[PDB]
Amino acid sequence: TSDPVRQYLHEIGQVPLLTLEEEIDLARKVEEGMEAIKKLSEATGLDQELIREVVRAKILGTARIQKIPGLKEKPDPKTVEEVDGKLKSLPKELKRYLHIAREGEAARQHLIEANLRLVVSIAKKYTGRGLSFLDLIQEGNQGLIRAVEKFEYKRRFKFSTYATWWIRQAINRAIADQARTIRIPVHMVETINKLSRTARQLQQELGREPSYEEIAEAMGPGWDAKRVEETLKIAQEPVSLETPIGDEKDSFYGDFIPDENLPSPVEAAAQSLLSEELEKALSKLSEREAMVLKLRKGLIDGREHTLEEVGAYFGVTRERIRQIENKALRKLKYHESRTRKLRDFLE
Amino acid sequence: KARVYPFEDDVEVTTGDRVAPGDVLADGGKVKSEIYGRVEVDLVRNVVRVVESYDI
């Protein structure tokens, strides 16, 4: 039924492997291309990666590379074409390094494709992560590219080594950057791994699972029960709301979760009643002090007013405002003990 | 399957351009490859050939 994995498998199956000869030739053609770019940088006085990408623009497709980097990366007619024209002004010795360059550029692609059959075989022991087959393999191939650009054939080492070391990394990074729904930075993943590792070891030995005492003991210095327990708490991942229930296939999870982040119908009339009855009990105070109170507690502009400010527009000193709101407060305290209307709202 | 067009002084074309029946190839319009296809510039063998291809 159109398997996505067999697609890629037979797609890499079309391009054959590479023996010693082809490999060395490839790498050499690549480094030759790159150093060619290095001289071509001195040619027109440009950068490495600049001309290097300009080469790509003419090789792995023309309009398509500059068309969808996303809405803004670099202009095609402006910062690209002028680079083509500017390097067209050069003689034999110069102009040939261009062809050398692009040749090496193709050699890089051939190299990556030839060794892809490895990267696919690398992510197979790496399954069971927070990512599936293709998702893993691709992020491994991303490591294959960097494994290519940094490789040196002069060291007489088979590329299958230097590549594999970069794949084994790229995947183990790919898990650290995806994994759990919540994002966990590298170091945390590391420490967690060490913890579970220790667990697996002393549980294999002792014939039973450890305690936060012994597991942190075996973890070395600075490791106590509280810390291992802490990182253990962070270790767990969120639970899906689509989680089924018991024997009933119909029963979901999230339908059991209440909304407390929105005011309950009772709370609406509650806050209303408070804001009303308070305004009623406020009218028994002097025109100044009553205003000063709601200016102080932010029932006016929604913000607290320092004694300095309440006194600034009233002309009175801060001390005056202070005594005013104290007095007014207790003058309210007289009526409240009587009516017992607002003696509620005590939480 | 292709058609060879050896050159002498440089070229106006690069590997991966397309083609046309008698368009300038190399050496100020010395040779013109007449055919449809992909163009390959070879410094070693000092030739710029074209393998027969439509640009579909």
Added chain:
DNA sequence: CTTGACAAAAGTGTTAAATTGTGCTATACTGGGAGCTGTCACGGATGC
């Protein structure tokens, strides 16, 4: 409501201590993998 003196609350600048992000490891490693059955009726796209 006022004037000055002061504790505490809250500010603001520089720094020590953590937390977080990035990179590389060159003997040679070169196409995964798990399978699951005792429906049933019908309606449409597709194949003989």
